[PDB]
Amino acid sequence: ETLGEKWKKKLNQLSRKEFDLYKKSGITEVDRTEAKEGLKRGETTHHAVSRGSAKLQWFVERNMVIPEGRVIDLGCGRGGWSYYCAGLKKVTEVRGYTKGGPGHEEPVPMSTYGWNIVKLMSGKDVFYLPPEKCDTLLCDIGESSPSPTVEESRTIRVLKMVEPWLKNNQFCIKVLNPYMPTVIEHLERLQRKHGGMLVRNPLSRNSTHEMYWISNGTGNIVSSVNMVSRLLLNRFTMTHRRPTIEKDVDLGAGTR
Ligand SMILES: C[S@@+](CC[C@H](N)C(=O)[O-])C[C@H]1O[C@@H](n2cnc3c(N)ncnc32)[C@H](O)[C@@H]1O
Ligand SMILES: Nc1csc2nccnc12
Ligand SMILES: Nc1csc2nccnc12
Ligand code: NA
């Protein structure tokens, strides 16, 4: 039994009150107050549509993924990763795909900096899309489940779906459940072929063990995964630590 599976069993036993106190304990988060108020008013400039823009920003500012050329954003939801990439000088086109419909986020139209190079398309299930030529492949798909075997299936499905899109390109891919042994086996195979490394984002909630496979890095996947399991298990042992609260991103305005 992995450290991650022990964390999962403990998470599943939490009452709603305990879960609500645990999920943000000691994490980092952006203050969404101003963006939520502006989005409620129908403002289309400056605001990030979701917490996703700051989340991807964290990796990009650390050179973990360096978006460039034609960017594909799989599972774009409202479009946070797409609108953030649209403002980056090396980026020339952003194509976002998302499922939409009941239970799923629809793309939000915005006029943030670089909006003219963005096309967000809903009604697109990526498990039925043929791969396209691109210079950057982003993917933020992985639905949490109380069942780690359901999450293992969903993670493996994402890893097999993204591979044909990977052609010596920059990438940032969510790995919903990176601790299940079958997932580690696929990740090690993928890293041997395409390189990169698995990284824990400090903006991720403690309620998910997600890590992101990024193109610009090296390291031992197993070691990185167990470090997150230990961190997340340690966060059950202490009173809630209020999160580090940072300013949200300003995505500006205008065409590129
Ligand atoms: C974690 S959210 C992405 C948030 C986004 N990165 C942002 O910055 O706003 C993942 C999205 O993937 C979508 N999704 C889930 N399964 C999908 C699939 N089979 N095909 C396409 N989109 C999918 C969900 O509806 C959801 O909006
Ligand atoms: N998704 C959930 C809603 S309540 C709950 N409690 C334990 C595990 N998962 C859940
Ligand atoms: N109470 C909970 C324990 S685990 C979980 N996952 C999602 C929503 N609620 C819960
Ligand atoms: Na929804």
UniProtKB/TrEMBL annotation:
S-adenosyl-L-homocysteine binds at residues 50, 80-81, 104-105, 125-126. S-adenosyl-L-methionine binds at residues 50, 80-81, 98-99, 105, 125-126, 212. It is found in: Host endoplasmic reticulum membrane; Host mitochondrion; Host nucleus; Secreted. Residues 1-256 form the MRNA cap 0-1 NS5-type MT domain. Homodimer; in the endoplasmic reticulum and Golgi. Interacts with protein prM. Interacts with non-structural protein 1. Component of the viral RNA replication complex that functions in virion assembly and antagonizes the host immune response. This is Genome polyprotein. It comes from Dengue virus type 3. The lineage of its organism: Viruses, Riboviria, Orthornavirae, Kitrinoviricota, Flasuviricetes. The chain holds residues 2497 to 2752 of 3390 of the full protein.
